[PDB]
Amino acid sequence: KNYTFRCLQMSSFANRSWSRTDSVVWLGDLQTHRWSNDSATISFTKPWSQGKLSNQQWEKLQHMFQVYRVSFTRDIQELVKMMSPKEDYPIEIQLSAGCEMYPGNASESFLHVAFQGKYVVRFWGTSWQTVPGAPSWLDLPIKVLNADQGTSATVQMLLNDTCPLFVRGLLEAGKSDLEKQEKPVAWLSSVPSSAHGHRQLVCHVSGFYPKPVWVMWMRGDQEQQGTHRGDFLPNADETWYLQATLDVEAGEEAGLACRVKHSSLGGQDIILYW
Amino acid sequence: KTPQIQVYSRHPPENGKPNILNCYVTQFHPPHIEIQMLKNGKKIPKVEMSDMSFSKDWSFYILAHTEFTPTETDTYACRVKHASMAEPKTVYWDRDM
Amino acid sequence: EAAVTQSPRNKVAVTGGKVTLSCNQTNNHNNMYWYRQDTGHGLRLIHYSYGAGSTEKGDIPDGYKASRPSQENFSLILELATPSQTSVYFCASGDEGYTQYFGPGTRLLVLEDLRNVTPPKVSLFEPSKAEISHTQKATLVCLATGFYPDHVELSWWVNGKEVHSGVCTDPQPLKEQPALNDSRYSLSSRLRVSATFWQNPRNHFRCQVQFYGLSENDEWTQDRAKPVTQIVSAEAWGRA
Amino acid sequence: KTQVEQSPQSLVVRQGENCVLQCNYSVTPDNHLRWFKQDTGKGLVSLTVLVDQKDKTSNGRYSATLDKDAKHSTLHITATLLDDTATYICVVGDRGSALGRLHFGAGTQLIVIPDIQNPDPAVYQLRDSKSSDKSVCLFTDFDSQTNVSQSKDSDVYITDKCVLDMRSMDFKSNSAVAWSNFACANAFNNSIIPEDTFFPS
Ligand SMILES: CCCCCCCCCCCCCCCCCCCCCCCCCC(=O)N[C@@H](CO[C@H]1O[C@H](CO)[C@H](OCc2ccc(C(F)(F)F)cc2)[C@H](O)[C@H]1O)[C@H](O)[C@H](O)CCCCCCCCCCCCCC
Ligand SMILES: *[C@@H]1O[C@H](CO[C@@H]2O[C@@H](C)[C@@H](O)[C@@H](O)[C@@H]2O)[C@@H](O[C@@H]2O[C@H](CO)[C@@H](O[C@@H]3O[C@H](CO)[C@@H](O)[C@H](O)[C@@H]3O)[C@H](O)[C@H]2NC(C)=O)[C@H](O)[C@H]1NC(C)=O
Ligand SMILES: *[C@@H]1O[C@H](CO)[C@@H](O[C@@H]2O[C@H](CO)[C@@H](O)[C@H](O)[C@H]2NC(C)=O)[C@H](O)[C@H]1NC(C)=O
Ligand SMILES: *[C@@H]1O[C@H](CO)[C@@H](O)[C@H](O)[C@H]1NC(C)=O
Ligand code: NA
Numbered sequence: 001k002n003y004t005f006r007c008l009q010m011s012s013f014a015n016r017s018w019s020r021t022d023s024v025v026w027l028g029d030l031q032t033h034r035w036s037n038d039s040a041t042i043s044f045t046k047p048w049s050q051g052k053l054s055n056q057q058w059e060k061l062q063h064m065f066q067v068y069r070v071s072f073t074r075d076i077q078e079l080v081k082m083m084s085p086k087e088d089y090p091i092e093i094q095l096s097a098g099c100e101m102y103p104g105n106a107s108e109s110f111l112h113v114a115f116q117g118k119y120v121v122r123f124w125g126t127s128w129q130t131v132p133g134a135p136s137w138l139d140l141p142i143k144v145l146n147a148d149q150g151t152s153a154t155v156q157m158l159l160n161d162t163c164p165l166f167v168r169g170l171l172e173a174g175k176s177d178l179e180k181q182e183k184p185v186a187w188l189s190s191v192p193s194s195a196h197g198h199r200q201l202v203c204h205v206s207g208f209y210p211k212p213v214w215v216m217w218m219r220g221d222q223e224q225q226g227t228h229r230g231d232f233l234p235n236a237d238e239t240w241y242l243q244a245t246l247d248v249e250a251g252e253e254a255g256l257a258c259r260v261k262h263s264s265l266g267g268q269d270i271i272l273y274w
Numbered sequence: 275k276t277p278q279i280q281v282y283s284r285h286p287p288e289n290g291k292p293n294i295l296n297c298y299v300t301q302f303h304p305p306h307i308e309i310q311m312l313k314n315g316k317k318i319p320k321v322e323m324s325d326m327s328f329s330k331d332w333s334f335y336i337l338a339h340t341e342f343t344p345t346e347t348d349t350y351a352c353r354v355k356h357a358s359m360a361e362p363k364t365v366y367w368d369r370d371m
Numbered sequence: 372e373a374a375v376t377q378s379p380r381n382k383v384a385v386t387g388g389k390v391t392l393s394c395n396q397t398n399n400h401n402n403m404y405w406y407r408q409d410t411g412h413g414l415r416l417i418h419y420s421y422g423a424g425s426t427e428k429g430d431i432p433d434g435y436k437a438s439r440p441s442q443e444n445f446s447l448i449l450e451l452a453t454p455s456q457t458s459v460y461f462c463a464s465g466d467e468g469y470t471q472y473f474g475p476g477t478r479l480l481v482l483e484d485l486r487n488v489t490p491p492k493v494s495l496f497e498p499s500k501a502e503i504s505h506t507q508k509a510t511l512v513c514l515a516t517g518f519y520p521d522h523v524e525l526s527w528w529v530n531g532k533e534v535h536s537g538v539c540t541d542p543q544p545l546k547e548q549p550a551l552n553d554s555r556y557s558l559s560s561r562l563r564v565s566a567t568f569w570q571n572p573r574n575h576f577r578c579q580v581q582f583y584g585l586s587e588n589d590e591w592t593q594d595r596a597k598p599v600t601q602i603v604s605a606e607a608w609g610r611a
Numbered sequence: 612k613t614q615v616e617q618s619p620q621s622l623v624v625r626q627g628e629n630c631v632l633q634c635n636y637s638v639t640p641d642n643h644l645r646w647f648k649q650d651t652g653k654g655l656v657s658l659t660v661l662v663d664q665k666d667k668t669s670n671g672r673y674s675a676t677l678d679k680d681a682k683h684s685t686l687h688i689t690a691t692l693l694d695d696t697a698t699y700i701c702v703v704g705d706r707g708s709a710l711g712r713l714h715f716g717a718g719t720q721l722i723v724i725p726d727i728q729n730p731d732p733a734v735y736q737l738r739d740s741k742s743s744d745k746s747v748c749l750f751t752d753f754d755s756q757t758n759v760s761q762s763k764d765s766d767v768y769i770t771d772k773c774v775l776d777m778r779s780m781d782f783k784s785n786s787a788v789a790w791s792n793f794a795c796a797n798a799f800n801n802s803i804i805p806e807d808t809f810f811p812s
Binding site for chain 1: 280282283284285286287294296298303304305306322324325326327328332333334337339368369370371
């Protein structure tokens with residue numbers, strides 16, 4: 001029920017001149033927006049990406065970002081000159097802005113900034129501040145960014161007002177797409193493990209949504225505690241892939257099944273016998 | 275960090291039937307990476323890449339995928355060139371794994 | 372409060388020579404800037420610095436080298452001066468805020484040759500008895516003549532203190548020989564005071580011309596006196 | 612070509628009159644806009660600074676407005692005095708920090724013609740302190756309507772008209788000098804001078 005909205009930005013600076021900035025947006029585990037360096041405008045990846053904003057409201061908002069992207073590039077370039085020769089290219093900056101949605105009219109907006117893959121700066125209250133672990137040289141950049149009263153007021157409005165308003169629209173507009181149910185398909189296989197006389201049975205599960213799923217190897221009605229399931233790997237069509245592995249002895253795969261429960265199945269659990 | 279590669283099929287693998295092959299590259303920085311999907315060592319043209327992103331730990335990930343018909347003879351792989359590694363790493367698809 | 376100083380305020384140079392415009396600042400401002408002003412254009416940024424050691428290229432950096440030896444000083448160095456660098460150069464400073472506190476300005480003239488450079492002859496003309504009787508006012512007239520180039524600052528001093536009230540100076544010097552190319556200039560200025568102030572014989576009136584020309588370093592091949600940056604003046608007491 | 616354009620390029624107004632200076636820009640973004648005042652051979656005196664979307668400012672006789680939507684700014688000058696004779700520059704800063712660059716306009720040359728109350732035209736002869744052989748002719752105390760012209764003889768030198776301001780007495784008067792190597796009666800021949808000009812002797 002608690003959906004998290006994320007606006008991920010990735011900025012690469014190779015030298016003084018060359019730089020590119022790319023962005024994506026996620027509502028839960030669904031991409032809502034894309035914005036390539038090539039493109040001058042933000043691309044919708046869903047039909048409901050505009051949400052409950054009018055066309056005029058979106059244009060004002062898009063232009064705001066269009067200005068930011070140009071200004072961000074130059075600011076960073078100038079901040080490097082300011083610190084130099086303390087820090088130098090190549091540089092990779094990452095932003096992770098967004099707002100978690102809680103039931104009622106409750107939310108928590110955030111704007112996290114990372115420098116060379118290390119979370120260093122955030123926007124908190126009405127100003128930029130560093131976090132524990134951040135170098136001390138960042139203090140001058142922070143001092144400069146906090147001097148810009150206009151940027152502060154704009155970001156405050158963006159986090160406090162715009163983010164929760166906008167996302168509340170998305171959840172309504174893309175309700176059916178968020179609450180969609182897709183059935184997993186399963187199939188079995190085996191490979192030799194590190195051990196000499198040991199097999200490793202694998203239970204594949206693919207094409208299910210949402211992410212929550214239950215997969216276990218079973219002997220009759222006895223849970224095999226050896227079962228080790230891997231990571232949730234994505235599919236192209238916005239569904240999930242998962243495999244569960246169980247280490248066994250060779251010639252001891254008789255009466256071993258893989259049970260799979262999922263919300264979309266609705267009672268009728270999948271069972272595949274070896 | 276050295277990039278973790280994982281190859282897997284969308285649908286159950288059966289000889290003859292068309293299918294989609296996925297290649298999920300994760301846990302790498304900087305984000306400048308060159309991903310290739312191979313068929314018997316040869317470069318497959320027209321490979322669809324997902325938009326690049328990152329996780330809570332600021333580590334980049336990307337999903338490459340392409341259509342394929344898995345035969346008994348043919349081998350499929352995913353080759354990754356990255357600054358972290360010296361020689362490009364190649365992970366082969368195993369229908370069993 | 373946040374003041375900025377530039378030196379020199381006025382400079383004459385020849386093509387090929389070295390020119391060093393300096394800019395001192397005691398505000399502890401990290402950031403300093405260099406602009407130039409040209410009639411028809413706005414102020415354009417040449418170089419700027421974010422701190423001691425740092426120097427960065429502006430919009431029009433070509434022909435200039437910057438130098439930030441300390442927080443206070445920030446110098447603009449013309450290694451090989453050219454006529455195209457004839458301009459008014461402004462220096463500025465500022466902290467992290469957007470405000471840039473500008474200096475008073477620096478005029479630079481880059482001549483082709485220094486052969487025709489000459490300081491002025493200053494004459495002070497006393498007011499007429501006709502004027503005093505008619506208007507009950509006394510107009511002194513100053514006259515700088517036969518000087519080149521036209522980089523002069525004329526000022527009036529009464530009892531060793533500069534007067535601004537009741538002063539009028541010509542906006543642009545007129546040429547003595549308009550026909551000739553490198554013509555010497557002339558400049559007039561006027562100081563009007565009350566008759567009783569002029570009639571007071573304890574008031575010392577003086578017109579001073581600050582001529583800018585050659586320096587000690589500049590070589591001189593001609594036989595006449597070296598036309599260096601100097602002051603020429605004329606004086607007169609009051610009389611009843 | 613430039614990102615900041617001002618209008619008019621120049622203008623002439625009589626003392627007491629008002630005048631409006633324009634400033635259009637294409638700078639993006641536009642954090643603030645500042646109006647400077649540059650007297651002849653002087654520095655940059657700041658008049659005001661505007662920051663809001665629809666901002667209004669004042670500084671006694673000076674007042675200004677700004678519309679960021681239109682990217683337009685005006686500078687009103689109520690009751691122009693002689694000292695307002697200056698170049699008025701328009702500046703736009705694209706940030707609210709030291710990261711920003713300043714985009715300058717070419718400026719607007721204002722010329723205020725002074726209001727002479729009581730004219731009393733005359734041409735006096737002055738004498739040099741050092742040697743009394745030399746002299747100059749001082750045409751003075753004429754209203755702004757009178758225009759002085761260059762001499763017929765090139766050997767004779769005549770300056771353009773210029774105004775001074777005795778601030779203690781609140782008094783203004785035009786004046787012009789003439790000299791050669793020549794009498795004051797013959798000095799300002801090639802010039803439409805008033806008929807009631809006092810030539811003393
Ligand atoms: C974020 C949540 C949005 C949710 C809703 C929409 C979602 C829809 C999807 C969107 C897709 C795009 C996703 C992209 C996600 C990544 C970006 C997230 C963070 C966005 C930050 C927004 C910043 C916008 C402001 C900006 O452009 N600043 C620009 C431009 O600012 C200028 O122009 C503005 C125009 O708005 C203002 O003028 C208007 C104005 C003047 C005066 C006033 C006032 F109040 F005085 F009267 C008011 C206004 C401002 O006053 C002016 O200075 C400024 O240059 C910023 O410094 C850019 C950089 C900011 C990020 C810094 C991150 C920290 C980096 C630290 C790393 C240091 C390392 C160094 C080696
Ligand atoms: C927007 O909301 C923030 C608070 O919200 C928090 O920060 C956001 C950036 C998001 O991350 C939210 O998820 C998060 O809940 C408001 O910040 C607060 O502003 C007030 C009033 O300006 C601050 O009060 C001041 O406190 C100082 C001492 O610390 C006093 O000296 C001042 O006199 C004054 O009382 C307060 O510090 C600040 N809160 C925090 C936690 O920093 C912000 O005002 C608001 N802005 C708008 C435009 O709505
Ligand atoms: C990323 O985008 C920026 C902004 O669009 C590109 O910068 C422009 O590049 C074009 C041609 O490549 C130039 O004509 C412009 O002068 C640049 N404008 C600005 C504001 O920088 C940049 O080249 C892009 N980078 C990559 C690698 O694609
Ligand atoms: C800047 O970096 C890019 C990308 O690595 C490179 O192609 C380019 O040659 C570099 N340019 C300069 C001037 O160093
Ligand atoms: Na200029």
